[PDB]
Amino acid sequence: GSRSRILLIGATGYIGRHVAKASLDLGHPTFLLVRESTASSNSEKAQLLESFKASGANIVHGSIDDHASLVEAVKNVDVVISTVGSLQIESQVNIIKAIKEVGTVKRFFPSEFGNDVDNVHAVEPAKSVFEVKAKVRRAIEAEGIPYTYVSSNCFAGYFLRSLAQAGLTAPPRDKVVILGDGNARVVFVKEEDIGTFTIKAVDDPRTLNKTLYLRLPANTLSLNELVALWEKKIDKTLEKAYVPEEEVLKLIADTPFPANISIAISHSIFVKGDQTNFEIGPAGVEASQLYPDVKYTTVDEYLSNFV
């Protein structure tokens, strides 16, 4: 179970909890940075930490708004994996200053785990959300810090489970709204799989100073293909609506915060096809060609459960 000491900053977040679990499962010494908080006011969180120290994670008590707790937690580790929320994507500049000041960190993974922000054709407000991450990448690069940018694409438990439908928690059995032509390919990855491939890249030299894509073969399809795989399984036809790009942009302009960020990320992904409309260059590498050994849940597998 390899050897390196990993620090998770933002362990209780949506993808952070899966990256933390797999850190423990491929057997590393896992450190979790935790800010002092009132636990009744932050219940599910306290309970998630409870279960991480029960699994064996080593809690460091800190904040990225405390350089002294950051430099300390960073001295202590080999790779730093940030999985913070959108509210503090820009505050990762603190983790960089501390990573710079310490010198002992072998690899920094910033909070990415979605689209590759240097290869999107996004419209506002999504265009600005992505530009905050891109700017942290240029700051990691300016410091000379060793990095891996994980571009894990679409969370299966959000987008696949909903069949890319804005409100849902289960695949619709009546109707779907397909944005654009429905032929842009997307890739969906189960969150627990995102956590495993991320932890497998930590010490590998093929992922040093690379963007790691998760372009998983069995998991790459268009919404047309996904609706058709599910009409088959549920053995009935869904009523469909087709929304062109122009009608999606009007929707974005006429929706307030935060739902306009949702619809604009969905234009980048489902209309523009931003997860699959560019080639992995010299500075990129793919997780299935790099770790062919990992068995990931396919879209057919994840969908058969909801049938």
Next chain:
Amino acid sequence: GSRSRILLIGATGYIGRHVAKASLDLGHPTFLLVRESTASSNSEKAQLLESFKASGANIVHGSIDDHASLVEAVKNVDVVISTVGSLQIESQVNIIKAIKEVGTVKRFFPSEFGNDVDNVHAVEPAKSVFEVKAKVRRAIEAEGIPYTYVSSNCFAGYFLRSLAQAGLTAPPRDKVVILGDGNARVVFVKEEDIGTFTIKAVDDPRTLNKTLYLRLPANTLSLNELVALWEKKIDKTLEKAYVPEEEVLKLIADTPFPANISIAISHSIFVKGDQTNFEIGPAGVEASQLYPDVKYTTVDEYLSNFV
């Protein structure tokens, strides 16, 4: 006579457009800080700008980030209204330094137009979102800028046309999901009316250093009374589902950005009832009792267009 000059920052945003309209309709000198009118990109923006130019507005050049464009723009006015989207709220601190240097400005309206962030019982991530706006209020107050905070509660175009169902667009005809008990009262306001009441307030001594609340009597209702009114309109009863606070909190935790912000803002409004569960204090003022003049669109009138 001599009418007050209004500069509006964020004029093409979701609410800024309705404020800019009303400044022009109530005969104020209207100046709009615009950076560019992008060649092919947001031509909706461009044709919005054009509409306001044709209607009488003066386009001032510059942005929240050119400090000199801002100083030069705020010196030539009496009232400054900011309606920037959530991604730039934190940067309105640029507008505070420019207003503070100029001395001239009689009133600053920060980008509020929602819940009173100083009377909120929110959970994360909404808690953190509400606080960057609370952080700006304090800074206005710290440099002693005259101000008016517009707490205009629920936008009818997002929350009333949907009957508080996320997924948007039209009131359901079958079932409805209600968060909490459905008795927490909320105030729905049509965006046009939010433009009106904001401008009615720019000169008033009664709103000077006050929080102006839109608790419009015919529009303040609980979601259980809303479903009942609509049920009556379409002469049919819907099914209801009540989600307890424990599962609302769990869903926020198990949903990614930005949808978790959406759910945490619905928790504040529809489960905590933060729009109506406090008393308007000595530094608050209410809009319909201040302006009995404005024949605001009522919920029944708004909802009739969906029958």
